[PDB]
Amino acid sequence: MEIDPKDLTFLKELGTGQFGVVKYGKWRGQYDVAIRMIREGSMSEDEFIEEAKVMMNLSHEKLVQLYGVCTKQRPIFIITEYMANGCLLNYLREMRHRFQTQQLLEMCKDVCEAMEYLESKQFLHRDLAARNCLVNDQGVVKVSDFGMTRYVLDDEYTSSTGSKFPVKWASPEVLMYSKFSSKSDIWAFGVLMWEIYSLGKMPYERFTNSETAEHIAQGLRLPRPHLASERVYTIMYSCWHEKADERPSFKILLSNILDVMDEES
Ligand SMILES: Nc1ncnc2[nH]nc(-c3ccc(Oc4ccccc4)cc3)c12
């Protein structure tokens, strides 16, 4: 819903992200929030604003909430639930010796639940990766920046061969046909699981985007992480079926996750 900046306070700088500067602050006094100032020239504003009202109506505990927006000025402001521990990728790397596999599987339940809610609303992410997931003060993981890639003007960020396109998280049908589906978000979730159990290592770190695309196209798949059990690996590997219809839905995935958690007792 629209927010009068009168009701906001800027308290600290969190840094500049892919879509502009971000700061920590307070909304209506009692709400810790992160206000992002949208880089000018980066977004299709009208389309993004209209879709923002939709992402406002998406609510789930494991999804970084959108509390409102300031659109009658530029740069547009986006007021979101504040995640004290920052990006999940850097959270994974900083506490490399402080995560037990039970906490890792928890982080996977969190992501899978958020993506199952997004699946059930027939809403696509289009860029699921650890760098777009955030962690709050209680170690809980939440998805964010969902559907944001739909509104980027830079063609490098959108085209299959763009220099900034996340090939290493993309399914074969996204690289070859630009066919986005919940199944491509599932492929991406598989890669994300690999990020989690790898404690934040870059998938195919030493591959050019092209080399990755071709290897993926010919059957190469990420190696089982050291901290991943044969059951966890089975789940993230099942996310990477060549045939989209052969990949299990996020609901079936969450169930498998819960089965592994139960067997981890
Ligand atoms: N919410 C944060 N909490 C702590 N640190 C942070 N750094 N950056 C952000 C951030 C802020 C706004 C934002 O817009 C959104 C929000 C939800 C969905 C899509 C887009 C996406 C990310 C952030």
Curated annotation (Swiss-Prot):
Q: Which residues bind ATP?
A: 14-22, 36
* Record domain Protein kinase: where: 8-261
Keyword Acetylation attributed: yes
A single Gene Ontology molecular function, please?
ATP binding
Q: Which residues form the signal peptide?
A: none
PTM sites of type Phosphotyrosine: 157, 223
Q: Name one GO biological process term.
A: apoptotic process
- What positions does the record give for the motif labelled CAV1-binding? 187-194
What phenotype is described for loss of this gene? Prevents BCR-induced activation of NF-kappa-B.
The GO cellular component terms are: cytoplasm; cytoplasmic vesicle; cytosol; membrane raft; nucleus; perinuclear region of cytoplasm; plasma membrane
Report what the Swiss-Prot or TrEMBL entry states about this protein's PTMs: Following B-cell receptor (BCR) engagement, translocates to the plasma membrane where it gets phosphorylated at Tyr-157 by LYN and SYK.
Q: Give the UniProt keywords, A-Z.
A: Acetylation, Adaptive immunity, Apoptosis, ATP-binding, Cell membrane, Cytoplasm, Disease variant, Immunity, Innate immunity, Kinase, Lipid-binding, Membrane, Metal-binding, Nucleotide-binding, Nucleus, Phosphoprotein, SH2 domain, SH3 domain, Transcription, Transcription regulation, Transferase, Tyrosine-protein kinase, Zinc, Zinc-finger
Where does this protein reside within or beyond the cell?
Cytoplasm; Cell membrane; Nucleus; Membrane raft
What are the Phosphoserine sites (modified residues) in this protein? 210, 229, 265
Answer yes or no on keyword Chaperone.
no
Q: Which domain of life is it from?
A: Eukaryota
- Where is it mainly found? cytoplasm
Q: Could you name the active-site residues?
A: 127
Q: What does this protein do?
A: Non-receptor tyrosine kinase indispensable for B lymphocyte development, differentiation and signaling. Binding of antigen to the B-cell antigen receptor (BCR) triggers signaling that ultimately leads to B-cell activation. After BCR engagement and activation at the plasma membrane, phosphorylates PLCG2 at several sites, igniting the downstream signaling pathway through calcium mobilization, followed by activation of the protein kinase C (PKC) family members. PLCG2 phosphorylation is performed in close cooperation with the adapter protein B-cell linker protein BLNK.
- Give the family per the record: Belongs to the protein kinase superfamily. Tyr protein kinase family. TEC subfamily.
Oligomer and partners: Part of a complex composed of EEIG1, TNFRSF11A/RANK, PLCG2, GAB2, TEC and BTK; complex formation increases in the presence of TNFSF11/RANKL. Binds GTF2I through the PH domain. Interacts with SH3BP5 via the SH3 domain. Interacts with IBTK via its PH domain. Interacts with ARID3A, CAV1, FASLG, PIN1, TLR8 and TLR9. Interacts with MPL/TPOR.
UniProt domain comment: The PH domain mediates the binding to inositol polyphosphate and phosphoinositides, leading to its targeting to the plasma membrane. It is extended in the BTK kinase family by a region designated the TH (Tec homology) domain, which consists of about 80 residues preceding the SH3 domain.
Q: Which disease is it linked to?
A: Defects in Btk are the cause of murine X-linked immunodeficiency (XID).
Protein name as it appears in the record: Tyrosine-protein kinase BTK
Protein encoded by which gene: Btk
Span within the parent record: 396 to 659 of 659
